[PDB]
Design a protein around this ligand. Structure first.
Ligand SMILES: *Cc1cc2c(cc1C)nc1c(=O)[nH]c(=O)nc-1n2C[C@H](O)[C@H](O)[C@H](O)COP(=O)(O)OP(=O)(O)OC[C@H]1O[C@@H](n2cnc3c(N)ncnc32)[C@H](O)[C@@H]1O
Ligand SMILES: *Cc1cc2c(cc1C)nc1c(=O)[nH]c(=O)nc-1n2C[C@H](O)[C@H](O)[C@H](O)COP(=O)(O)OP(=O)(O)OC[C@H]1O[C@@H](n2cnc3c(N)ncnc32)[C@H](O)[C@@H]1O
Ligand SMILES: [Mg+2]
Ligand SMILES: [Mg+2]
Ligand SMILES: [Mg+2]
Lengths: 448, 450
């Protein structure tokens, strides 16, 4: 009987396991995949790292910053310089030193007042208990889209905001409760923290990619602690401990930490069954929809034309793009996303069809050289059986107030981690690390 | 390990309807059922010398499949009691008695209610029953909650309040949780707002003598010996070019095709190899089941009848929104049937049976009167706590789900086909729709074998 079994070797499960180990307790980590990292995933292509999952860290994300400094992983900055390209409907593409400058003064004022009003709501939502916001009932009964419509902003401001909503949540403003969106904004420290490159969540990348950071963290566990390719099928508990059922047999432990996405946590055969509020909470925490891609060129040819590699095209299937080129300055990479409904349409299509859509948008925005592609690499996170959607879960109207209170509460000897249980930077790597520290501290107090 | 033409997962009305159709067409069939019984979301226990329907209980006009099955298998109906005054208790003031609930409203309020139901029916008729995502305004209707749509109409507070009671009693969810497209499809599927909410002439018109689980048991008895396997949950469903391998705790069954006939949330928990396509997996994440605790309060006699009361109370501002006289034809024991719905169901499910009893008796004491404290017994079921349902009455879809994920609802995944009330075109969410879905999935499987 080990002291603690951890289900999942993402940043949450690995953080919890390392904290249990460092306190002197025995720990086993059971991971479904043949690798650690979960929603972070890095492959070597064209002599560099391709981050197919989470890739960016930014100011305010102190837990991931500290971990990367501890384990010796250096950062490099997201490129910021050169003209962004903005494309509206059937128009001609517009080059601007920033996205902002493609909108009128009145439009920019309406956008900043809309963001400001969402921040003023956010600041009233308690990070540990969104259901205890003074206006929780009203805010939980309203979609973000209904709230945006009630502000009277112009069409183009609503469309620009919607690009930002889809880029952050991997879901439309109609899918999200206003209470969910407000908690998320509060959790990150503001709308600028979510949407900015410099000063925001997209500021910095990790040299070598993110999955090798998770690997360095797993290398702090003793040999024998990690079991890969070992999906957890069942989790039983009684007065004396827990029993974990796998295809290849059973593990006995005193306590468990389940650190997987909510929809996957619900699919485990729990004995006794989870209490009904927690089962229905997981039914009400759907994962987002995102296809992430990297278009590979021999060189970042856009930079010589004075372009950043960032395109903003509210009427196209892809959202914002980014220059994904490593510090070596080759190969050239354009990074971007299909989000929400576009991700679901694109996921039903082949890699080749997705390639063709992306290359066509870039050809009409960055220029005709976009057609001279070396390679196109993508990942539909909704098709990953051990994730079933990126970036993370969202909550539709009525879920946070009625089912939300069951989010973190241990069920007997079973404790919960994962980015979706974080108070700060929920949905991000930094939040996953928070959640593992919290679950470890709970289990260590319970064993003692 | 055993080999058969068709394996059916689940012995609700959908799985049993399918299994019987496959059997009668001359194919070999196994039915694997997780529980030690058939019936699923229909469940009947014997208490106080009568039947207690803990699950589905009513059938009404326009439900032709369940009416035909009951007649075929010799199950008689009895009418839901209609007579006596209903009691309406609004957020303010004393309880009002009226020969019908509508008489509790002002003329302005009744007009507003009927115009709101009529405007919803007009939208509902434009929603194709086979493909709600092909409605001409699907994108707009799928982006709006039913609550937002109601707010836009400008009806008075008491009208929104009563409409909310009906919404929660029909969907086991609040108007905020539901897309307008979902609600509208459901209304079209039933044949209108009256069909959903009426007793006489609607879905609550009739009961089955003996209760509903005996009907499911008579349907299971139409299968050959050895076809039904109770207490056999399905854990895994592996498929290849030639068949499907069904994994249970103790073994495996090999079939040519499978019909999975379980609630959407439980279908998604089965270990599929290859994994389900992403649109389908994400649709199941967007099909949460409702939240209801159903109760029967037992009295020696239906005492409210001697006071000229129907035993129906309507309370927009109480944890119990609606009740019915549940008394069997013999006239004893007296029964008051009712529901905790939505947020009230989740709050009540966290408390004990005795605590839920004391909430119900408090509402009934203030509406039916003092004799409501003279309880012989109290029987209830939290359908959210049932591991093989995880919420009644059925799934609903939040905003954005029908147009983006919805097209994957019925489409087979190789040799795995889908049944259940949630896949029905007509009377979706009812026993009638469970039966439709079983006939459809059997016809599909029989056409694809040859
Ligand atoms: C997918 C993605 C995520 C992402 C993003 C872009 C995409 C396409 N961009 C990000 C970014 O640039 N910066 C950032 O900070 N975050 C970004 N995100 C989100 C981020 O990747 C996630 O928040 C974070 O990685 C989540 O970590 P957590 O540890 O909470 O969850 P996980 O990585 O999903 O790990 C769960 C592990 O459990 C395994 N699994 C699942 N089920 C089982 C069972 N039954 N048995 C055993 N193991 C199981 C998974 O395989 C996984 O390893
Ligand atoms: C619960 C409920 C339902 C209900 C209602 C009141 C309540 C509290 N009132 C209704 C009414 O008065 N009239 C009516 O027509 N319907 C009413 N409803 C809804 C109705 O009960 C359902 O629509 C209908 O019964 C649904 O039937 P279906 O056949 O589609 O589904 P099921 O009954 O849930 O059966 C599924 C079976 O599958 C088994 N199961 C689940 N998972 C597994 C696995 N993994 N392996 C094997 N078997 C599985 C279940 O145990 C169940 O038997
Ligand atoms: Mg810039
Ligand atoms: Mg009447
Ligand atoms: Mg019609």
């Amino acid at each position: 009987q080990v002291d603690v079994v951890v289900v999942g070797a993402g940043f949450a499960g690995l953080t919890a396991a390392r904290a249990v180990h460092e306190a002197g307790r025995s720990v086993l980590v059971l991971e479904a995949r043949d690798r650690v990292g979960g929603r972070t995933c890095t492959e070597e292509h064209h002599g560099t790292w391709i981050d197919l999952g989470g890739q960016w860290i930014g100011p305010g994300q102190d837990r991931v910053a500290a971990l990367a400094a501890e384990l010796g992983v250096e950062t490099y900055p997201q490129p910021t310089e050169g003209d962004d390209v903005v494309l509206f409907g059937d128009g001609e593409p517009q080059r601007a030193p920033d996205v902002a400058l493609a909108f009128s003064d009145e439009e920019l004022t309406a956008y900043l007042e809309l963001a400001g009003a969402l921040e003023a709501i956010a600041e009233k939502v308690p990070l540990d208990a969104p259901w205890l916001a003074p206006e929780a009932a009203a805010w939980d009964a309203t979609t973000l889209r209904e709230w945006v419509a009630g502000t009277g902003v112009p069409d183009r401001v609503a469309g620009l905001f919607e690009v930002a909503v889809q880029a952050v949540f991997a879901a439309t403003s109609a899918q999200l409760s206003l209470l969910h969106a407000a908690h998320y904004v509060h959790s990150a420290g503001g709308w600028s923290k979510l949407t900015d490159t410099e000063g925001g969540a997209q500021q910095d990348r990790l040299v070598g990619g993110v999955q090798p950071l998770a690997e360095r963290l797993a290398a702090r566990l003793p040999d024998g602690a990690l079991r890969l390719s070992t999906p957890v099928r069942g989790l039983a508990q009684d007065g004396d401990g827990v029993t974990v059922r796998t295809a290849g047999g059973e593990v006995r432990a005193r306590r468990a930490i389940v650190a997987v996405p909510p929809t996957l946590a619900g699919r485990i055969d729990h004995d006794p069954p989870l209490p009904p509020q927690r089962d229905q909470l997981l039914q009400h925490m759907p994962q987002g929809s995102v296809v992430k891609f990297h278009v590979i060129y021999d060189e970042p040819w856009w930079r010589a034309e004075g372009l950043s590699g960032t395109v903003l095209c509210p009427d196209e299937p892809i959202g914002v793009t980014f220059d994904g080129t490593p510090p070596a300055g080759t190969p050239g990479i354009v990074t971007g996303f299909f989000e929400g409904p576009a991700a679901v349409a694109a996921g039903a299509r082949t890699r080749e069809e997705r390639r063709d859509v992306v290359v066509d948008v870039l050809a009409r925005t960055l220029g005709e050289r976009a057609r001279d592609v070396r390679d196109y690499i993508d990942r539909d996170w909704s098709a990953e059986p051990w994730t079933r959607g990126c970036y993370g879960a969202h909550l539709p109207p009525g879920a946070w107030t009625v089912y939300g209170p069951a989010l973190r509460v241990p069920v007997g000897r079973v404790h919960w981690a994962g980015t979706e249980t974080a108070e700060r930077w929920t949905g991000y790597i930094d939040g996953a690390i928070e959640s593992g520290q919290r679950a470890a501290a709970e289990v260590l107090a319970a064993l003692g």
